Amino acid sequence: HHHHHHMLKKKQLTVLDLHPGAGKTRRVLPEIVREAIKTRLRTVILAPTRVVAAEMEEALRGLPVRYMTTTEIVDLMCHATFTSRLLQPIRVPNYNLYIMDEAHFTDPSSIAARGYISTRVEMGEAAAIFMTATPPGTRDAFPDSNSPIMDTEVEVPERAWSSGFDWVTDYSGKTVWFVPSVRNGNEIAACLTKAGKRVIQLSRKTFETEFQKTKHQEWDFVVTTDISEMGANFKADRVIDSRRCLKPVILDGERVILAGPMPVTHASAAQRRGRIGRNPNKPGDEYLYGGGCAETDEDHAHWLEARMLLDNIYLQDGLIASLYRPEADKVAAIEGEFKLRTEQRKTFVELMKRGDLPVWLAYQVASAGITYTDRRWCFDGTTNNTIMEDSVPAEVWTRHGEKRVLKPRWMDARVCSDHAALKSFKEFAAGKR
Ligand SMILES: Nc1ncnc2c1ncn2[C@@H]1O[C@H](COP(=O)(O)OP(=O)(O)O)[C@@H](O)[C@H]1O
Ligand SMILES: [Mg+2]
Numbered sequence: 001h002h003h004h005h006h007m008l009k010k011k012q013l014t015v016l017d018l019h020p021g022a023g024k025t026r027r028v029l030p031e032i033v034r035e036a037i038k039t040r041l042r043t044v045i046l047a048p049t050r051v052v053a054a055e056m057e058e059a060l061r062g063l064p065v066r067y068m069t070t071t072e073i074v075d076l077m078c079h080a081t082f083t084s085r086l087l088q089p090i091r092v093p094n095y096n097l098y099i100m101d102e103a104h105f106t107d108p109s110s111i112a113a114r115g116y117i118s119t120r121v122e123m124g125e126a127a128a129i130f131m132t133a134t135p136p137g138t139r140d141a142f143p144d145s146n147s148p149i150m151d152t153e154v155e156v157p158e159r160a161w162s163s164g165f166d167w168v169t170d171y172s173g174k175t176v177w178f179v180p181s182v183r184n185g186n187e188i189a190a191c192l193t194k195a196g197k198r199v200i201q202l203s204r205k206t207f208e209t210e211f212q213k214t215k216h217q218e219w220d221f222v223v224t225t226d227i228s229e230m231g232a233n234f235k236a237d238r239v240i241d242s243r244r245c246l247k248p249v250i251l252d253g254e255r256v257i258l259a260g261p262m263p264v265t266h267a268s269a270a271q272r273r274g275r276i277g278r279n280p281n282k283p284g285d286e287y288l289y290g291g292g293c294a295e296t297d298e299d300h301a302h303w304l305e306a307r308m309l310l311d312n313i314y315l316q317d318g319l320i321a322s323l324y325r326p327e328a329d330k331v332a333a334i335e336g337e338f339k340l341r342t343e344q345r346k347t348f349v350e351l352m353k354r355g356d357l358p359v360w361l362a363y364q365v366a367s368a369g370i371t372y373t374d375r376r377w378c379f380d381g382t383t384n385n386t387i388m389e390d391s392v393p394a395e396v397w398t399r400h401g402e403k404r405v406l407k408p409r410w411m412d413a414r415v416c417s418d419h420a421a422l423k424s425f426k427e428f429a430a431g432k433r
Helices: 024-038 050-059 079-087 108-122 182-194 204-216 266-273 302-310 325-330 342-353 359-367 419-429
Strands: 013-016 043-047 065-067 074-078 097-101 127-131 149-153 175-178 199-202 221-224 238-241 244-251 255-263 285-289 395-397 403-405
Touching: 013 108, 024 043, 024 050, 024 074, 024 097, 024 127, 043 050, 043 079, 050 065, 050 074, 050 204, 074 079, 079 108, 079 342, 097 108, 108 127, 108 302, 108 325, 182 199, 182 221, 199 204, 204 419, 238 266, 266 285, 302 325, 302 359, 342 359
Parallel strands: 013 127, 043 074, 043 097, 065 074, 097 127, 149 285, 175 221, 175 238, 199 221, 238 285
Antiparallel strands: 244 255, 395 403
């Protein structure tokens, strides 16, 4: 009940960079929405995840918002839903105001959304507010917090241990642990469970369902990938941060491998640490971090994947949206080089949305003129593209009634990097998803 005016203006992009936990999502977003409704500004609110969309729903109770997730001149949807609708024939309104929460998110749909939105603003067609404690390029891993944090550099294990890490388990509070990969998290979770700890595991595939268990069940550790690192409210006392992640890298323009683990950005480290120190009544939450940060993330496939999406979004005849200016030097590409014709673009969209294929892999298949249900390409690659299950070639019973080795024409290590990913890709290859 302490509303502040936002004298909003078209032709302007505002970066709202209040520190983690300052109340961007819970306090400032509702103020902006009130001003938007009053002034009849057609507005979209963009959430990075269904979890943040749920936290926005709570904060926006009483305000007329159309939720396009799970009279009303404000719409709310996920970053990925916005970008997917921009690729499709579907009528996406020409919003007067774009509000992007967690505007640092580096998933390709989020990078593409920022490029589209910043281009609309540069063209003088709209206003935008990018809400993030860690705008692109930030070199500050230790921003302000609601409560003092104890920051300690330690050796953080990335494997099961039988000695040398007593501080991990001799701790009676709640810990969020950022691991380099789903498989490393599996191994750490099993070590913690053997030591008598109650562990919840989060990844992109499982976040939207498993996060609810953090609100509803008792737990000692959340073992999570980077999906959890922003806009997640955990009731935690300690973060353990590997400060490292596997990175998908395009090798020789022909395949995607998972490289590293490699250091995270200062933005990622700040958001991970920012999960604690959020309660002003609870000083001395701990952030225990396992190494340094780096801004050398140009090898990450997500920058080129963002160009693949942007090249396929219509703005105006002959105009392709640029990446948001501070991100524009992340990728060597020719503007438009990934533009697909109408039917190939529909296949591209369906492979990402219904197929759950990575952007790069969906683009290879769609650009080859393959239709969505034609899975021959899953079996006709070179022998070095053979996918392995328990150190033996993975086998699929195909729609054509043959037992065939999984051997895709284009290899993207993201489809087979963990048991759940491979299970899903095997079903996809069988025409059974
Ligand atoms: N369910 C809740 N009830 C009360 N306080 C909450 C709840 N969820 C989050 N908070 C607190 O509200 C504050 C603002 O959080 P939030 O708006 O999510 O911050 P930001 O978006 O700037 O990171 C933080 O101190 C956070 O701990
Ligand atoms: Mg927030």
